[model samples]
Target: GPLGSARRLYVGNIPFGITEEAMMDFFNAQMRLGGLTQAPGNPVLAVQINQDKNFAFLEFRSVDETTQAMAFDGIIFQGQSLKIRRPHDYQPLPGAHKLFIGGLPNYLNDDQVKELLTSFGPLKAFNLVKDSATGLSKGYAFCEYVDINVTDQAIAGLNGMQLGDKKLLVQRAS
Candidate 1:
């Protein structure tokens, strides 16, 4: 369901005083380096940057490449680490096993985010709270499981855990 409009990948940690063209070259070159073959067209569709927010929204040719582009998280350019991720509004739906996650490194895409929690239980819904304006991560997200009982263990195990230089704050959300 979310894949319908999930074309933009949020890019954060952009160094100031850089042009979009330069950044595009950096990204396209990375595409070449990775040899990520493009299907619909050039994998890099367009890039919109906001130095004010120090973030960018990178559009891809398709969701497939967008997911692939997620591999670029933490890729350093201009001596700065860039966080790549799905758009702020990426949501599939929610289940009653609702839980919360915070202190994420902003270093993961949807797949990795799911991977972060899949050990808890099969997820019924998962959504990271990316910034709508800056397109950066809020370092928090909400999720649910097929089995409501999984929430307790999910929180108990993930909470106080270290990830990406930060400790998790897993808990129940409503």
Candidate 2:
């Protein structure tokens, strides 16, 4: 049964010296740990590495695997944290201006989160990740600013700032 929904994941901040074989091994290991086994096809369909740029595009067999892999965003690999995102190359049109905000406090609501990010600029859209089952905060959110330049300012100001006990991880959303 072919249920192919192959998706490409953009991985950044990779070490320049990593080899293709090593990358596959790491990805397969992660897949195993995430409870996905390669049967019909491997979760990691392929990896295209750019040694000079220290980035790669990892192709997953299905969107399910791609979603699973996204959980590894900001995870340490060979001593460097990886920035996992959707590939920028494939797009119907130009993308919107957005920022990914991580390491949020569970107690904060959508309005509270929006209030904190308002200083950056007027937001076109904002979302706080919440569990569908329990409606609890998932410790992350995405914000889209009307003006693209404001995203840079927000990242510079909000990044590493202590909101409650957790320091925020603010970066441009890919």
Candidate 3:
């Protein structure tokens, strides 16, 4: 039951200067403000700031706490209202299992790409971006693994490799 429920939340538009500790403090304060925080391990399980400083993710102790935190989506924190959302399967922060493969050559088909990528690991899904009119590659695609466990390996193995004169840009899909 806990596994199926959301334990992580996507927080965007955070102020540039907010530290991880500050973000946690703000969340804890919000929980207090909302009369929430009754059930728990720590109000915040973890906080991860994006490399760009524009967004962050909050891992909560439980789904209930996460839902409660959602109420603060538009609440102001240090003069900026935060934007919050739930990530697909609690990803692109921790246990991220998807990769955005950019700069694909136009001639590559799904199977060829899948064959190339499977060298890293078996995948849950491999999508080649295609144009509706010509049914040709759109120079980008996304790959997801059946198990989140192998994501890092796949990203590491596949990123920055040559593919028909173009080097692939593989990174966690956000």
Cα lDDT, all candidates: 0.79, 0.79, 0.78
Better of 1 and 2 by TM-score: 1
| Cα lDDT of model 3 by residue, 106-155, tens digit | 78788987887787668877778898998988888888876565778877
lDDT of 1 by residue, 111-154 (tens): 77889799877987789888799887777888888666577888
Q: Any runs in candidate 1 off by more than 4 Å, and if so which?
A: 1-4, 93-174
Full ranking by TM-score: 1, 2, 3
Candidate 2 residues 21-103, lDDT tens each?
Answer: 78877988878877765455468867899988889888777766776787888988889999987655443222466679999
| TM per prediction | 0.54, 0.50, 0.47
Query: What's the distance in Å from true for residue 64, model 2?
Result: 1.4
Worst 10 residues of 3 by lDDT: 88-97
Model 3: runs farther than 4 Å from truth? 1-5, 90-174
| Residue 63 shift from truth in candidate 2, angstroms | 1.3
Clashes of 3: 0
